[PDB]
């Protein structure tokens, strides 16, 4: 997703191409609510 | 249509609510935050090292101290001065008089569309030469470290230490370009566009974050100390956010009315 | 054996907007989780659809307009519909739109009366498509698209400017007044004079808000203007 | 026919950290087996988790501390918690940590009493999070996190410094005392004076060890400092 | 490992009539529909097959 | 179709290679009719 | 394994890319035991 | 010569690994070549006459 045109092939592994968050153990929704 | 604006929440309408009509088709989605920010842009222009350097001292520096200025560039959209983070952007409207002139930088587009409060994204860097047929290299070290300053003697030829190290160093052929991407490596979870805290527990300067950047970059000529030339050289730095995200709304700059 | 290939004329070129990635250098990094921060923004339209205060000249700028007591047939206030016009300059809709080239959808305007609870009156709001000369009287205003708004319990009243254009999409700046940039005028008329009981302040004030519509849309990003730093 | 392709802007570049291999030259070599060597190391944490001796000043350095006989309210000894501090310099935890940039987890400290078997006494160990000024008396020390250790049959006693930080990961060097580098102090208090029978040597000595915890972790390698060769 | 390859003698050449495309720069654009315009021309023979007036000399 | 020789492989996605018209909600036929 | 990003394709054979030992005919375990 | 980083992290006693080499010029626009021979040999020292 994003400004990325390729849709078929990825050479390097995901964990080397991107950063990841280590684990721990449609239409736009609105901001601001009234009740 | 009757409504109350004091409640803060107002529901968006269409033409058909009060008149005869119909709604328009979607169109395109060019406003997506991820798609908007993935474009390279100029950040700063720096000189090229030809010997071992001396990192600039902290800001309370008095006169007479010896160091090298304008050789290092920070990687951060926020304002900076003298290769160190700042809070207020600077500008020399009268280039005259004594004193060293302080380097400055800023990300005009990023702060023109900085509508939020917190930000996070990877970052891809590129460098380009501003001199005809130049040979150079680029070095980098992560946030929260320092640049080693010394040299070694090989065959009676001094060789600066920044040649070697387990943190990336890259070389380019005649007239070539250097490109690579970096991860988000700061200790903080997100980068604060605007801040109002203090880092040190006392004698701190409010609103000055400590580690809001990706790292630091510099360029050098792969030759020994014995070949210090006579003319200065410059390069240009390009950055491009990748897979960006935002977290909390804010306001935009104030466009002054003539 | 080696695969034989011939590079094209476009090689070693550096293109800023190219839609592709590059080679990593320092991979295998893992970052802290960010589940704890609420209110992630996914599209800037979420912010474009929030009303904000406009500006006018008091001759040196204020967001409101003071209702006079004199009687005259000219419109109380009238401004063009062009996102580059000063009135929309500081509002979010205009500020964001100045970074793009085209737009669609319906603009939205809102008002709020902040006078004494004891007052009573009526106002007329009209929107005039482009013409040789702009409207200058109630008789002319009545014919265009318009609505009647009366002071009562509720304080605010919303108005929608329909998207009536000779072509899909429209320019967001007016270098020259072609039909694709300017789209008429908006004007407010005081239908009846205000009634107040004795010993009350005169000349109440009215307030304006501007925001994007439901079916608003932008397109084709463009580089921004850095003059604000000076 | 030739496959047409266009090389990117990044070509002929030499990147030291690139995650990929290169072309072989002298392959097909077979080497002796190494099944006979025991104790293969798989991760340097295995070595980081081994206690070692710290250092102090006797004014010119020794690992132990001599318990005096005078009476005073100041802490017997106190040092900051910062991996770049001299006390941790030669210990394995500090030496290895100086080659990286961030860390997590809990540090561990251990003591051992090497006095005569006939002695008896008690000691107080405390850990103070950061403050404007460091603790200077038992009354202040009692409030922070602390524990009581008494001389008995067994000789050693372990203490764990909890990881209490405003952010995940912390810097391993202190260029300036931001809250992300320094993390308070550790101090030892003599609760009661030592009791010895007649005809025994005075001023026993106590010994220190420092090691990594169970959930210790490092990250983000960095280049090392070669000054040791001089 | 890197795939070894050898470019042919014809490299970096610019050929106007080459039957292939190039790299995009500003993609993801969407345009208005054109269903409303009638009389699309598909081949110029459609126009070549329409009679027209010739010319001669009146001198 | 057109002056395009490739018939096997496409790298970039269609929406990035070409422009598209957003939705709304053989022998040659002759031009000009008589009735 | 290691500082190697590729995870899909290998060109040269294993015995030419690496050296091998000729035959003859998880959590970290601790070092040093007491009994 | 010496390997400063390797001996700064030399926490063990025995070591084994393959090794990848690279060379780089320190002069502008130089033409050169590189040669190698395995452990436990010697470099031949003589020349031949061609034309
Ligand atoms: Ca090639």
UniProtKB/Swiss-Prot annotation, chain E:
Localisation: Virion; Host cytoplasm
Coiled coil location: none
Role of this protein: Forms an icosahedral capsid of pseudo T=3 symmetry with capsid proteins VP2 and VP3. Together they form an icosahedral capsid composed of 60 copies of each VP1, VP2, and VP3, with a diameter of approximately 270 Angstroms. VP4 lies on the inner surface of the protein shell formed by VP1, VP2 and VP3. All the three latter proteins contain a beta-sheet structure called beta-barrel jelly roll. VP1 is situated at the 12 fivefold axes, whereas VP2 and VP3 are located at the quasi-sixfold axes. Vp3 also seems to be involved in the binding to host receptor ANTXR1 for attachment and uncoating (entry).
Positions spanned in the full protein: 435 to 493 of 2181
Annotated signal sequence range: none
Quaternary organization: Interacts with host entry receptor ANTRX1.
Protein name: Capsid protein VP3
Domain of life from the UniProt record: Viruses
